[PDB]
Amino acid sequence: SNNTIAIPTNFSISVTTEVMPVSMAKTSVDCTMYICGDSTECSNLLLQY
Amino acid sequence: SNFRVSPTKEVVRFPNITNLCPFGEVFNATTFPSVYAWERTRISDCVA
Ligand SMILES: *[C@@H]1O[C@H](CO)[C@@H](O[C@@H]2O[C@H](CO)[C@@H](O)[C@H](O)[C@H]2NC(C)=O)[C@H](O)[C@H]1NC(C)=O
Numbered sequence: 001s002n003n004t005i006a007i008p009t010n011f012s013i014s015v016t017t018e019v020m021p022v023s024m025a026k027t028s029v030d031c032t033m034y035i036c037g038d039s040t041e042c043s044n045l046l047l048q049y
Numbered sequence: 050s051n052f053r054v055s056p057t058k059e060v061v062r063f064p065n066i067t068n069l070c071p072f073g074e075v076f077n078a079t080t081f082p083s084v085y086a087w088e089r090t091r092i093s094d095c096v097a
């Protein structure tokens with residue numbers, strides 16, 4: 001209506017939880033051990049990559 | 050990475066069956082099968 005307004009007569013204090021990711025697990029790969037295991041022969045072929 | 054350790058010793062372990070396989074008999078039979086009637090034999094418990 002062009003001539004009426006609603007005013008809050010009261011209030012509520014609210015506490016709200018916002019959860020945010022900030023980091024992830026730091027990961028490391030031994031690329032030689034993953035590809036070749038311990039085999040010397042494969043490690044020599046891997047050098048060619 | 051890893052350049053610390055390299056193997057040097059070799060551990061070779063096999064079943065201690067020492068009987069040599071009968072190849073000298075299988076191969077030197079006085080007659081072989083006709084190919085239409087080829088014969089199958091098990092080879093077992095021997096060193097090839
Ligand atoms: C807003 O509403 C709350 C209730 O929802 C009012 O608190 C009540 O006030 C009466 C009278 O003062 C008490 O008898 C109740 O026990 C109160 N209840 C609670 C839960 O506190 C509050 O007064 C209102 N705020 C305003 C500014 O009027």
Ligand SMILES: *[C@@H]1O[C@H](CO)[C@@H](O)[C@H](O)[C@H]1NC(C)=O
Pocket residue numbers: 077
């Ligand atoms: C096959 O066996 C016979 C009898 O044991 C022997 O005379 C012959 O020399 C053998 N041949 C070969 C190629 O071993």
